[PDB]
């Protein structure tokens, strides 16, 4: 009908998709409505009504299959190409006519472009020519055949180049044509012509301030180094001013993939202040914010350009200007959140800045990102977040890292970077050996909270967590084996968590674990040995029942003494063995009677009854007095 149409374009208070119900009868709608559109679109209406028209037309256009019923739309669309407000709506409407009638819609377009060209030639003014280039730049990426043929025709080149020579002072003509050149670069044949016949024109138009941005855009796409450097320098300079934000942001995001661009950008202090200000500003578009975050993450990234310069930038422009702390109170989409995590990761590559990151709330941002993706996408971004989290939990006190929130909610993610029982394995996260090492360092720090009770409760709630730790007891990597033993030694400060895994001698699996642990006392890695000794010393000096059983284990006692005879020069290892041995010897006089005639053991104890080490003389005396007990 015709009143349905007035409702669709009358006011924004209408839902065109809802009106479809009024467009029930296929024909009436497939006909009258189309006829009403043909008669209505024969004039140009206000941008409000035009917006609603080209928001509804695509729907009906997609459904119709008869071409003779949608053929008029090509002229209607192409004749509105100079109306900048509806250009994206016109493109969608033309794309709607691509699914069907593709061949007939391109041929109708060419016949109109050819007619438009003749009108431009006969027009003493510039408006017909602007309309032709605007029609071409609108429909170029979907009608390449007829658009390439028009652009490359001598009749079109002739009128274009001549009007760029005579009317250089017409910014709407020049900037319309610069957009056509840039859009048309999607075709290789067109790019070659522009890179072979427009370099001079572009050199002149680069001298005019209001043509610079679009000229540099064309020059970027026509690049088959001062040609590039002058173009980039324009993008940086224009962006620091605050103008043409969408174009410079999209251009600089792709350009900052090259190190030389990053160095140039990092050296321009004016644009770095502007990028941080724009990100913090509540006025900038989400599309611009995403690009601004992409540039910053690209420029803040550590290489695998100088590191100290990148580190100096991250401190002076991201950390100094509180970029991270403001990201907490800004609306971020998933893709911008991905770059924010990427920026946090980049800054944490310098451990001196980790404390500032945590103060600015980076920990909570990693945690919330990980929780939101936990059941959604364990992708490369999910892994990157854990990497940043591991490095954070290594260098800062855990209790101060998550806004007074328990740092143990991080535990599950760290466990994800630890190899699972081979029986299962196959983890989306492609964590490396270094990731496992770093997660284990972080878990060891989490194990320091409340004598390990809190992390122990998490390990006890999921047998998969303990299996993962046990699987690394004999890892081929020294640093992973060392960090695993350290983790266990902290968890042995309270027997609730994992003491049964090693000291339940009635369980064969646990008893075999104990025998393995005993043998690990003679590992070649001193850090590992200290931790193994700490495991034993911790529970022996804390649980009398376990201490009593340990005091009856001949292989533990002989191994500890053997290690003591040969490595007592290492302070930490010595103290830990002395605590273990005095605990054992105080519980078992018959163990003492075994060693009462060990000459080398006694003399090594006597030398230490004489640094910040008060436990060594005290425990040596106590053990020697117990041996004296067995003699007098």
């Amino acid at each position: 009908m015709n009143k349905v149409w007035d409702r669709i374009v009358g006011s924004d208070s209408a839902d065109a998709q809802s009106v479809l119900k009024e467009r029930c009868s296929s024909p009436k709608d497939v006909t009258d409505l189309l006829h009403v559109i043909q008669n209505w679109t024969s004039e140009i209406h206000n941008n409000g009504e035009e917006t609603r028209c080209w928001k509804c037309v695509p729907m009906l256009a997609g459904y119709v299959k008869d071409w003779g019923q949608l053929e008029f739309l090509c002229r209607r669309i192409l004749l509105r190409s100079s109306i900048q407000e509806i250009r994206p709506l016109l493109l969608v409407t033309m794309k709607s006519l691509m699914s069907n009638h593709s061949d007939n819609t391109e041929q109708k377009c060419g016949n109109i472009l050819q007619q438009l060209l003749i009108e431009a030639e006969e027009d003493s003014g510039n408006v017909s020519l602007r309309l032709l280039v605007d029609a071409m730049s609108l429909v170029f990426p979907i009608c390449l055949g007829v658009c390439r043929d028009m652009f490359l025709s001598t009749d079109f080149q002739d009128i274009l180049t001549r009007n760029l020579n005579s009317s250089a002072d017409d910014e709407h003509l020049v900037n319309g044509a610069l957009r056509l050149l840039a859009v048309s670069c999607i075709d290789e044949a067109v790019r070659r012509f522009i890179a072979e016949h427009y370099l001079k024109t572009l050199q002149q138009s680069f001298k005019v301030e209001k043509y610079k941005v679009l000229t540099a855009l064309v020059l970027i796409k026509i690049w088959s180094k001062e040609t590039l450097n002058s173009c980039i320098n324009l993008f940086i300079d224009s962006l620091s001013n605050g103008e043409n934000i969408e174009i410079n942001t999209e251009a600089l995001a792709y350009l900052t993939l090259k190190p030389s661009v990053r160095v140039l950008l990092r050296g321009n202090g004016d644009v770095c202040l502007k990028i941080i200000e724009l990100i913090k500003s509540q006025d900038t578009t989400p599309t611009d914010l995403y690009g601004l975050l992409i540039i910053l993450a690209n420029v803040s990234e550590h290489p695998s350009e100088n590191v100290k310069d990148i580190e100096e930038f991250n401190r002076d422009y991201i950390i100094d200007l509180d970029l991270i702390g403001s990201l907490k109170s800004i609306k971020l989409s998933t893709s911008s959140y991905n770059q924010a995590i990427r920026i946090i990761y980049n800054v944490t590559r310098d451990k001196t800045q980790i404390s500032e990151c945590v103060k600015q709330g980076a920990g909570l941002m990693l945690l919330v990102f990980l929780a939101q993706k936990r059941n959604l996408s364990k992708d490369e971004w999910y892994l990157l977040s854990i990497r940043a989290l591991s490095k954070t939990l290594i260098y800062v006190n855990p209790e101060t890292a998550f806004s007074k929130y328990s740092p143990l909610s991080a535990a599950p993610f760290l466990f994800e970077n630890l190899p699972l029982p081979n029986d299962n394995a196959l983890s989306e996260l492609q964590f490396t050996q270094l990731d496992t090492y770093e997660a284990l360092l972080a878990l060891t720090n989490l194990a320091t909270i409340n004598q390990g009770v809190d992390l122990g409760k998490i390990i006890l709630s999921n047998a998969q967590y303990w299996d993962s730790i046990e699987n690394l007891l004999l890892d081929s990597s020294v640093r992973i084996q060392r960090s695993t033993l350290e983790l266990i030694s902290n968890l042995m400060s309270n027997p609730m968590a994992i003491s049964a895994k090693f000291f339940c001698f009635e369980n064969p699996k646990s008893a075999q674990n104990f025998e393995i642990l005993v043998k690990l006392l003679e590992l070649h890695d001193i850090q590992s040995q200290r931790a193994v000794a700490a495991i034993f010393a911790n529970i022996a000096s804390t649980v009398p029942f376990i201490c009593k059983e340990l005091s009856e284990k001949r292989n533990l006692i002989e191994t500890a003494i053997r290690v003591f005879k040969t490595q007592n020069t290492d302070t930490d290892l010595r103290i830990r063995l002395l605590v273990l041995l005095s605990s054992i010897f105080n519980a078992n006089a018959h163990a003492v009677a075994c060693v009462k005639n060990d000459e080398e053991f006694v003399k090594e104890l006597q030398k230490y009854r004489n640094q910040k080490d008060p436990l060594t003389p005290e425990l040596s005396k106590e053990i020697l007095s117990l041996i004296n007990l067995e003699h007098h």
Binding site: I394, L441, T444, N445, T448, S489, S493, S541, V579
Partner: peptide, 7 residues
């Protein structure tokens, strides 16, 4: 008693 910490 014996604690390993990296921070």
């Amino acid at each position: 008693k014996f604690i390993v910490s990296h921070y």
